[model samples]
Target chain A: SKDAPQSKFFQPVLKPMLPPDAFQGKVAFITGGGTGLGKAMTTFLSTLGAQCVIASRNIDVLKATAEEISSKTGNKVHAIRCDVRDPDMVHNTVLELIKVAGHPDVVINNAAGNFISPSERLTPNGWKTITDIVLNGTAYVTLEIGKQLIKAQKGAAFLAITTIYAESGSGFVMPSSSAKSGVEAMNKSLAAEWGRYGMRFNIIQPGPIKEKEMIDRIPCGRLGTMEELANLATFLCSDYASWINGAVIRFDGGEEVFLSGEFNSLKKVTKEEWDIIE
Target chain B: SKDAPQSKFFQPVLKPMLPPDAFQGKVAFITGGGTGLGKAMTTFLSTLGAQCVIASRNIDVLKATAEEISSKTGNKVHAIRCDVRDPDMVHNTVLELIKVAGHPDVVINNAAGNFISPSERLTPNGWKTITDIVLNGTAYVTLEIGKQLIKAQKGAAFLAITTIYAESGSGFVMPSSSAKSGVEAMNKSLAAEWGRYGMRFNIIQPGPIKGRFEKEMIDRIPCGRLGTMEELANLATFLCSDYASWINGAVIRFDGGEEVFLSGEFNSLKKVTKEEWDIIE
Candidate 1:
């Protein structure tokens, strides 16, 4: 069991922060909810009493994930097959989801792709593929759902899954760097422009959660948990985050700031290695 | 005549901050340097003894601008036709620039396009137009010139002209918000990746410098006034010099602390000693 790493902590060790029915009767549309952090967040949202429709390119994985979550949380969950990069498909998927679960009061743009490579060796096609999925796909989902939320007169909430370096660029992942920046910016634009209609937008930049080498580099002396990221997402989407629009919060346990500081003793790359061109 | 709004300030009121030849034997490539803040920055760089190449879409305007600066400052300036949105043109222009004036040591991604409109009403084409110019254009020029700098082992400095709201998104400028945010991120990534090679990247998010709307803007900014173009140029010139080398990935606000005073939640809390805190405790 991959989950055994965090098994040392008691199951459901911390009680839910929000009220039991905080999301009662609400509907949420979450992208890429087949597994990992996405599935964990979907489970939390459902446990808090929200009807959810999770979509991704893989229908088999989506179905299994929905069933697993439904059985575990005793909450309604549905699976939809759609590639977020296709605008027409995204629009239709949202329409279908509404027919089954009703108009979503909340939307989460969580689908993304990344790979490590030196910037010079990155081809144009590789750059376009990641940007299209992360940046353009986010825009398609947000705009389509935004149109619906405005029509229903129920202002909406949006949470984007971004990486820490979305604001601070890193060398090995150029495509994600450029694309995530656009995604964060889009959230801000909607926050300011749609505030009059009671719409809210925010982003969470997560740090290393499961990777051992990555965890050691964090100044917190450990990796973040899926629970921590999920909890923060729940709070931001809840009513308490109404006044916190246009904010970019980091859930990385201070790792992002530590990496940027001069005195970070955890940096493994030696001065000699830095001198060599990658 | 359009420049009359900022004409009242004593031009170059402050002396140059760095040595007169701080940029001696160096070359600089600046986009949108034909007029406004671009020209102001170009003039300062020339004053510090750097040969300059200023490019924009309008060849006529560029030639006139080059002549104006060259005549006024006795420093050689060249004009080139470049639509930053066209990557092929940008690449060829940079090569031509190097052939005529030598490789540029400083690159300023200052060319930008922005307009005020509601985000919902902004068409896809409209959004693409601004993003193409600001985000993709900046990437094209930076990557092309970056390769040269990396090859020559000369190291380079990049300055991006971003807006304050790039971090704090504002309404009526949705396209610019997303595009400038991308530009700022690109700068930060380069700073971290290229730092070993001694390349540095920084951004100046300047507030209103011209008059007309100056009074209204000042009310929002704590400094209660707009920044002078010369002051911004001085900072750019200082950075182009070597003493501030370790300063990388910083988005310096020349907006008189307006954003912090208005949007920062902690600003409203008054400072108190242990005795005052004990009352609440």
Candidate 2:
């Protein structure tokens, strides 16, 4: 079991801030639900009374995680298996999800892949592999599930789990940066595409997490908690945020918030400029 | 000399809402500044104290309109001529604009073209004509000026005058519908592309207007000026009417402040406070 490491200083509040019944009587389809943020969200949502169905390529691990969370929450968490890069597989997985849960009120695209490089080549083949995995995963998930939601006359929140650097491109991990930030653009288009379909789209850009060699840059003074991530995810995907569409939310404890902000930097001399003279 | 018809019931304020000096020492470059919305914005901005440069293919019309607005506001308005459909032409014109007004503090793409029909064909040639005119104008205008802004390490607001139907598709005017809506999507992409460059991008989707244009706009009457039967009938008749026989494509403007209401996704999150997060914790 991958124990999600958290900052010693800023421990997470595991309790759901949303109404305990907010997601109750609703269903959520979380991609990459086998581990990390997806699993965390699934657990939080199940406790909140949602019928969560998590999908990914790793089946046995997903089943184990699903059963553990469901039993713990006294709610049923279903596990469907598929590699989202394959279009048909994604379609088949959607069929399975529909059979178990009908249609989702919330769709969280937590499924993503990245590499922290010792040394990597940006060859065409390598680039294709990365693009295929991330972009294909997103496109298929949205198109397949979205097509279903549209037909069913249902409206749902589509949220993507992206990184802090998605807005500001990173060099070391250019592939993920370009692809993920690219979705920041991708989601913008999709928000309008189905605006007529009663669909709302948004993205959450998370900053450095545990396994964190970096912390000083994060203004909140710690790495983000999985529970905190889940809470915001729940909030954005809820009806409370029905009007929050075509947005890129910086959930980075204000990491990117501190950059290039001369006005914010003015906090250094906030004593009405008189104290400095004194 | 087109008369912009306005409603007696819901007349346009035609006054500046932003600070009078908002553009006091600033510069603005508006395409299609010879007439219509571009000319309208030029006059408004000039009145608000901006040095406005308006561009169009018609050199004399742009110059004339520029002189008229300049004299009225007591603000100098410069006219630059370029068709914008040609990339090189846009580049050359931008150079002329810079020579006259330096770099603009605001950049707006308002030049667009379309035609109405008695019996129009959706021929490959016709479709190509509309797309080339609309998309090329936007792309070249954005790229040329945006490249200059990037080089100078400056940030400015970039706005596009899109229509309400730009969100929804319309049948009679498929080309403009697709091109304009396509720019709405296009603006979404550019918003991110230059976000790192200290530039902000936004679009205004104005609903119906008066040509006596049309305005069934009352249905979405978040802004309650003129949502009407006559207004809508005006819109319907004009689309088929001989008076606007050349009005094959039109983007009307009349929604009030709802544009900014839905502009930002996280804008609503502003209501959530640090205390709220503390409480959550």
Candidate 3:
């Protein structure tokens, strides 16, 4: 494995990209905002003086994140326990959001479900669970938020956090791939029909930023940093991207596009083999 | 979508590759032998004078195949409806097979489940159904038959029909990919461990013979013809015969250079640049 610790040379910039008050007075709603990429994004939004609300199935993780990020940014961050798969729960959560923060101007559908069971070994329950979470959850959240924002006669920036493999499905994470792909399709479809309602739906397919054993395959030769991810995510949901809608952005350091070409792997053929063939 | 009718240029060799009666008095057991690839293989083996039995969950289809192939070849073909996923059913099927024709000399695990539903849309039942059929069914059949053959001190050749996607997992048909992959692993493991039991396990991963669009596949393939069932049948026959006693643990890609052609990135850059390559120097 070519573990160059290449990350050392490509160290992540763990700082803000937008201004200190870029998201001021705005309400940003994020799902699964208690940990990892979701937590980092929530922190960035809170730092920019935005009213932040993080929701997920785990109330404890969400409550802790609310306290920590609010303390860090000197802003009150709200934690709402909601399962995106249940329509009624989502409806109730959105009502709660209205009381804590006004109709959301920036909505990030960041919750995800994934695992490493080989497709064939996956039980029926496991398959449906992932599909329910990744696809059903994202849809439930999007519909709940989009409808409220529309009724309030307000516009919004919506982004769905998908994965690079959503386009080219992988082996073990079949359920995630399928559900994520569906979410991408949904994002595009809504982006087409829901724009008249003053809503923009976009997708971000982040690559292997924290996963492993894929270094040699990725042409960029390194993983992306959480800071880099949050900045791009924030920018897309910012006013700067008001004109960008229905865009499927890849933030994988050029790793995803590099692997799809038919001849890319030929780099391993070596000069000697080419000389002989010629 | 250039259907070139490329298949016209490369037609099937319906004639048997081995001598007539090559499998005379030999008993061959085939699962999912009711239609398509399984049925095609059964036809060939029956023509070669082997006592053939085709089993599957579809009893009607199995009976039809047995009648048609038997009528065409003058060799009696047995049809049994045993769901490969059931251990008891497999045990009974083996017992029935023995009363009809001694322990099988060749076994082909060919029943499969597949469709074009996007993975996200697949129901829990759908996923489990495919997995149960392709993976669990193969396991039950293999173990059940292997035990009987071993008890009779018999040596048999076994083959599993997997898909090319088993190696490179594809979208939509994720369950099939996972299950087929497991079956391949099972084949290899048994090949290594069951040799002393007088059993040889091998696998054949068939490709989109009659599926896929034109450049979608044909352009990716160096040899443009979609492989035919007859060619696969011939390969299956040769491998299961005494001639291939040493050909154990082999996974033959029956696709016509399709697998190799799709692999290695630059292989598709053949159109506009090869002539000026020497000028760069």
Best by lDDT: 3
Clashes of 3: 4
Each candidate's fnat: 0.00, 0.00, 0.02
| Weakest lDDT window of 10 consecutive positions for candidate 2 chain B | B259-268
- Candidate 1 wrong stretches, greater than 4 Å: A1-15, A266-278, B1-281
Chain B TM-score for each model? 0.87, 0.73, 0.92
Candidate 1 TM-score, C-alpha based: 0.51
Q: Native-vs-model 1 lDDT?
A: 0.79
Q: What shift in Å separates residue B240 of candidate 1 from its native position after superposition?
A: 12
Query: Per-residue lDDT of A24-113 in model 2, one digit per residue for the tens?
Result: 888999999889999988888888889999999899989999999988988889999988789999999999899988789889887878
Per-residue lDDT of candidate 1, residues B209-265 (tens digit): 752334545544455556677888888877766766778888887766555443421
Please list all clashing residue pairs in model 1, or write none if there are none. none
Ranking according to lDDT, highest score first: 3, 1, 2
Let me know the TM-score candidate 3 reaches against the reference structure.
Answer: 0.52
Task: Output DockQ, candidate 1.
Answer: 0.02
lDDT of 3 by residue, A1-278 (tens): 44455555666788998999999999999998999999989999999888899999999999999999998898878999998888899999999999988899999998888776545568999998899988999898889888887788899999999987787765456788889999999999999999999999889998776634457656567777788889998999999889999999988866655544323344455457545534
For candidate 2, chain B by itself scores a TM value of 0.73
Instruction: Write candidate 2's Cα lDDT for B79-181 as tens digits.
Output: 9888878899999988988899988877778788765321134677778777776787898888888899899998677777776546644434567767888
Error of 3 at A221 (Å): 0.8
Model 2's number of clashes is 5
Residues A124-221 of candidate 1 have per-residue lDDT tens digits of 99999899999999999999988888888878789999987778765556689789989999999999999887789999988766554455445565
